[PDB]
């Protein structure tokens, strides 16, 4: 049902998913003039050395690069987090134009795309249980701008032809998500939600300040994906982003001065 089209986009989601109008919805605009440095944040720890990618899937809204999350292979800890969060998948949101595509915004600026590395809190045993908890997930968000190519993204780009349409998957082993990180791990953090239905308010968001650069050709290949299934009318998978939601009774904290 829901999507990013003319008649089922974000402004409609509340009908089936009333938390869309909830108190802790994501994404949000990050106002760098009101986010306050929090000296209590602990150091943030990205431990991806043992990550095991498995597969890439076009799910009809984005594509997910999936990982083995049956052991502590690729974990996020530190920062605002208590305990250990295991990487389950990453995916992106992107635009039809280089001036839009991100979900979070920074002083109202939209980036060309946004990467979400999704992790679940191991204290809840599995992802499906974790999403029912306010501290169930930690999502590392990374902005993409168009400029230089990102060499560590090219393996993703090159497999997209094999998953053009909804429901297609491909083997995708030995991919290193460290190749998608910027140099700095400085971040903003706030409590929020999944940005797609069911929009559950289970996420500690960790949004990196430093964007990564991807080339025009890399983003153009994202924009060749399809929302539709094979044999259905072609609808390019573009503008698969939810706009900023009201901050309400939340504060955004910065890890850096
Ligand atoms: Zn996302």
From Swiss-Prot:
Top-rank EC class of the record's enzyme: lyase
Tell me the Pfam families matching this sequence: Carb_anhydrase (PF00194)
Give the record's free-text account of how this protein's activity is regulated.
Answer: Activated by X-ray, histamine, L-adrenaline, L- and D-phenylalanine, L- and D-histidine, L-His-OMe and beta-Ala-His (carnosine).
> Per UniProt, what does mutating residue 139 to H do?
Impaired activity
Q: Which residues carry this modification: Phosphoserine?
A: 162, 169
Mutating residue 61 to W: effect? Answer: Impaired activity, rescued by 4-methylimidazole (4-MI). Impaired activity, not rescued by 4-methylimidazole (4-MI)
Q: Could you say which cofactors this protein requires? A: Zn(2+); Co(2+)
Q: Where is the active site?
A: 61
Q: How does activity depend on pH?
A: Optimum pH is 6-8.
Instruction: State what changing residue 118 to K/R does.
Output: Strongly reduced CO(2) hydrase and p-nitrophenyl acetate esterase activities
Q: Where is this site: Fine-tunes the proton-transfer properties of H-64?
A: 4, 59, 64
What intrachain disulfides are recorded? none
Q: Consequence of mutating residue 4 to H?
A: Reduced proton transfer rate
Give the binding site residues for Zn(2+). 91, 93, 116
Q: Which Gene3D superfamilies match?
A: Alpha carbonic anhydrase
How does the record describe its quaternary structure?
Answer: Interacts with SLC4A4. Interaction with SLC4A7 regulates SLC4A7 transporter activity. Interacts with SLC26A6 isoform 4 (via C-terminus cytoplasmic domain).
Could you identify this protein by its name?
Carbonic anhydrase 2
Q: Which gene encodes it?
A: CA2
């Amino acid at each position: 049902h829901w999507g990013y089209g003319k008649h089922n986009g974000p402004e409609h989601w509340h009908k089936d998913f009333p938390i869309a109008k909830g108190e802790r919805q994501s994404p949000v605009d990050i106002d760098t003039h009101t986010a306050k440095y929090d000296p209590s944040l602990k150091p943030l720890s990205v431990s991806y050395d043992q990550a095991t990618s498995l597969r890439i899937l076009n799910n009809g809204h984005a594509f997910n690069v999936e990982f083995d999350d049956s052991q502590d292979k690729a974990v996020l800890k530190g920062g605002p987090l208590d305990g250990t969060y295991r990487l389950i998948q990453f995916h992106f949101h992107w635009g039809s134009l280089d001036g839009q595509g991100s979900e979070h915004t920074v002083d109202k600026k939209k980036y060309a795309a946004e990467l979400h590395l999704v992790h679940w809190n191991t204290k809840y045993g599995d992802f499906g249980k974790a999403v029912q908890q306010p501290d169930g997930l930690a999502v590392l968000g990374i902005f993409l701008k168009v400029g230089s190519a990102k060499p560590g993204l090219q393996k993703v780009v090159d497999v997209l032809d094999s998953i053009k349409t909804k429901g297609k998957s491909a083997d995708f082993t030995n991919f290193d998500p460290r190749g998608l990180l910027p140099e700095s791990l400085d971040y903003w953090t706030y409590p929020g939600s999944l940005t797609t239905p069911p929009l559950l308010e289970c996420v500690t968001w960790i949004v990196l300040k430093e964007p990564i650069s991807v080339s025009s050709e890399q983003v153009l290949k994202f924009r060749k994906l399809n929302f539709n299934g094979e044999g259905e009318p072609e609808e390019l998978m573009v503008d698969n982003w939810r706009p900023a939601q009201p901050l309400k009774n939340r504060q955004i904290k910065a890890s850096f001065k």
